[PDB]
Amino acid sequence: PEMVRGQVFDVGPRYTNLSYIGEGMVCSAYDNVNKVRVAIKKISPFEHQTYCQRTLREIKILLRFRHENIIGINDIIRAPTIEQMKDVYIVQDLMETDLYKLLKTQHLSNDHICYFLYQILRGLKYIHSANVLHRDLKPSNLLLNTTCDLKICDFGLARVADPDHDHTGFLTEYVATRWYRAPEIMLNSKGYTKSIDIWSVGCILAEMLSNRPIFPGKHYLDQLNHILGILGSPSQEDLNCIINLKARNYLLSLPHKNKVPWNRLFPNADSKALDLLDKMLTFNPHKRIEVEQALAHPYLEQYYDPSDEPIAEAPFKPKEKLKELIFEETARFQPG
């Protein structure tokens, strides 16, 4: 049972020569069957039902999805019995970096931004075509290899779309990571519609243009301040779509704010990029561009090819039962 930083990282004999990547616990490791180094994440969820729920989602989703811009699961390592299974190891293609790391260190050329956005939306087209919402799109969930191929990861927070049951009250909901969370999450939305993901993609695009998050809320309640600071006050029509009174009257209480023009925030950006940005960062989720429209936008004309933007074959529909389900869902990787 081999070790790394005072912890068992027991993957053998198939996977050897381990190197620590970061934080469960992630390592690269040489795959002795396919002669390539891989990523391996050790997952230890069984003593927290929230960790079991998220692990089971990640697994079920990534096993069913097959797409060039979505990370696959190559293998899953665990004990032969439920009794002996204390951790699960998920083996994935090794990726050089992620968009979070790249944005901290690298200027992106306009051609890189265009290509990354294409790949993000291409992958999202498939996810949304399966009636699945990722719900946590952000730079660190976008993996990149040495040739800038891009793969979406971490479906632990995903849900099946449910637009008829999206409505809720004011300042309740926490969907996504704060800086990438759509304005309606704080107002009246449970984050059960596809427009939640498009907002996050818009935030990612903005961040690619300037290497800084566009809406860096310092805490949960600051996030709407940042969003409204740039988009300005919502129109009468967009307010009328918010029937809830606590949310509507909060917005009516605010002093008028004008829109900050994208070309002033992003003076070096491609004008077509800012036109698409505007449409993804639309306040009213009903008016926000959808993934298929975004793909068809002039900014992406060099790549757009709907016959090469595939869709999923069919839509997707307590701790101890979840441990059994995770055991069942991982059985295909056991010998024979």
Curated annotation (Swiss-Prot):
Protein kinase domain mapped to chain residues:
15-300
Q: What is the effect of changing Y174A?
A: Inhibits interaction with TPR
How is this chain modified after translation?
Phosphorylated upon KIT and FLT3 signaling. Dually phosphorylated on Thr-172 and Tyr-174, which activates the enzyme. Undergoes regulatory phosphorylation on additional residues such as Ser-233 and Ser-235 in the kinase insert domain (KID) These phosphorylations, which are probably mediated by more than one kinase, are important for binding of MAPK1/ERK2 to importin-7 (IPO7) and its nuclear translocation. In addition, autophosphorylation of Thr-177 was shown to affect the subcellular localization of MAPK1/ERK2 as well. Ligand-activated ALK induces tyrosine phosphorylation. ISGylated.
Q: Which positions does the record tag as DNA-binding?
A: 246-264
State how changing I61N affects the protein, per the record. Answer: In NS13; results in increased MAPK signaling; reduced interaction with DUSP6; no effect on interaction with MAP2K1
Q: Which GO terms describe its biological process?
A: apoptotic process; B cell receptor signaling pathway; Bergmann glial cell differentiation; cardiac neural crest cell development involved in heart development; caveolin-mediated endocytosis; cell surface receptor signaling pathway; cellular response to amino acid starvation; cellular response to tumor necrosis factor
Catalytic positions? D136 (proton acceptor)
Which key words are in the record? Acetylation, Apoptosis, ATP-binding, Cell cycle, Cell junction, Cytoplasm, Cytoskeleton, Disease variant, DNA-binding, Host-virus interaction, Kinase, Membrane, Nucleotide-binding, Nucleus, Phosphoprotein, Repressor, Serine/threonine-protein kinase, Transcription, Transcription regulation, Transferase, Ubl conjugation
EC number(s) recorded for this UniProt protein: 2.7.11.24
**Top-level taxon of the source organism:** Eukaryota
Per the record, residues carrying Phosphoserine are S19, S233, S235, S271
Q: Which residues carry this modification: Phosphotyrosine?
A: Y174
Subunit structure comment from the entry = Binds both upstream activators and downstream substrates in multimolecular complexes. This interaction inhibits its tyrosine-kinase activity. Interacts with ADAM15, ARHGEF2, ARRB2, DAPK1 (via death domain), HSF4, IER3, IPO7, NISCH, SGK1, and isoform 1 of NEK2. Interacts (via phosphorylated form) with TPR (via C-terminal region and phosphorylated form); the interaction requires dimerization of MAPK1/ERK2 and increases following EGF stimulation. Interacts with MAP2K1. Interacts with DUSP6. (Microbial infection) Interacts with HIV-1 Nef through its SH3 domain.
Name by which UniProt lists this protein: Mitogen-activated protein kinase 1
**Annotated gene:** MAPK1
